[PDB]
Curated annotation (Swiss-Prot), chain A:
Residues of the full protein shown: 1100 to 1271 of 1788
Domain Peptidase C37: 1-172
Biological function: Processes the polyprotein. 3CLpro-RdRp is first released by autocleavage, then all other proteins are cleaved. May cleave polyadenylate-binding protein thereby inhibiting cellular translation.
Species in which this protein is naturally found: Southampton virus (strain GI/Human/United Kingdom/Southampton/1991)
Protein name per Swiss-Prot or TrEMBL: 3C-like protease
Record note on quaternary structure: Homodimer. Monomer; in solution.
Length: 172, 171
């Protein structure tokens, strides 16, 4: 994945989020610190929040990331699309986990109720563990895919089954 | 602990530490002019070659941080292996491979002997992060079996289009 996509992935709360443009930041609702009253030097009064279940979008009053161009945010992706989940790991390592996307789903995972676009990891027989699959600290990482002439972002990482291949992408 | 620390840049490709003293790679990536590897003179290294599979056994512990792993001659048909691709870009790319028969295959016009496989990303796999490139040779094929990771070969070749790969094996 191009370096401009990795540069958008930002350590945030108990996981990650992703800069869509200089003023727009998306993340997984449950990684947001509940006590927080300031983000990137802006008080909550200067920020518009758009939330659908595990999807949260922040719109800032001023350019926070003026080095970036706005890119395309889709509401999920077509059934059968292969995405990469852009996960940052121990020691500046970059782990773009291949995922085939499927249906909109509601599931119970580790006792929590989750809703978004389901997918299956294409990394191994089972993705149990940190070498082939996801860990809790990966939530908020972006789902991206390559088209003929550009890259699209279509959601953020919300949940994964243990001893499985199944993931849930939260979508706008 | 991580399998990824075992994947090491080597020659024109990569190799894999099975144990503190044993290193496996693809024959064609090995430098053809050398007097030492990893600070050890070639005079104290044992080299075992079988076509595109090479194993080095060192006289001293190069990676004393590691435990010894299971090394087998390929795996049963229909096993879904993972090829652990390390990239100079800074990416780690684990890809699922459904394994087939051992054969002599024509790949981009050359004969390659090893275990066939097909990527689950499929034939219309579209980009650097869904398939292999020539610099990836020597990346290990692994799978989990009964509590243990098994290494069953090293990346030797791949088709230009479609989804075929070849794992070089021992013996
Ligand atoms: C050879 C140095 C590297 N470490 N991790 C990578 N992906 S390249």
């Amino acid at each position: 994945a191009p370096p401009t996509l990795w540069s958008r992935v930002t350590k945030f709360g108990s996981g990650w989020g992703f800069w869509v443009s200089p003023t727009v930041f998306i993340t997984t609702t449950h990684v947001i610190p509940t006590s927080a009253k300031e983000f990137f030097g802006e008080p909550l009064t200067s920020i518009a929040i758009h939330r659908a279940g595990e999807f949260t979008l922040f719109r800032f009053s001023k350019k926070i990331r003026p080095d970036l161009t706005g890119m395309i945010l889709e509401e999920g992706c077509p059934e059968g699309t292969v995405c990469s989940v852009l996960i940052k790991r121990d020691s500046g390592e970059l782990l773009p986990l291949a995922v085939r996307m499927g249906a909109i789903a509601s599931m119970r995972i580790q006792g929590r109720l989750v809703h978004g676009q389901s997918g299956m990891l294409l990394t191994g027989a089972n993705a149990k563990g940190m070498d082939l699959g996801t860990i809790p600290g990966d939530c908020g990482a972006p789902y991206v895919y390559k088209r003929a002439n550009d890259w699209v972002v279509c959601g953020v990482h919300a949940a994964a089954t243990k001893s499985g291949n199944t993931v849930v992408c939260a979508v706008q």
